[PDB]
């Protein structure tokens, strides 16, 4: 069996696409610089998920 021609329902984002991403923060401060980094890593994740499996 092959897949159907792409649709909204026939071509959804990959099953495990994350809808959120936590950055473990400290109790009353966040590291402005770690946050930045946090975003760089998710990016890399996101691309592998959507276009580079």
């Amino acid at each position: 069996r092959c897949c159907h021609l792409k649709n909204i329902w026939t071509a959804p984002l990959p099953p495990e696409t994350e809808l959120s991403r936590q950055m473990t923060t400290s109790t009353t401060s966040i590291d402005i610089m770690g946050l930045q980094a946090a975003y760089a890593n998710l990016h890399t994740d996101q691309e592998r998920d959507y276009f580079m499996q």
Partner: peptide, 10 residues
């Protein structure tokens, strides 16, 4: 482009 499935799919 509209669909993103993880790569090419025929």
């Amino acid at each position: 482009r509209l669909w993103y499935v993880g790569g090419q799919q025929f």
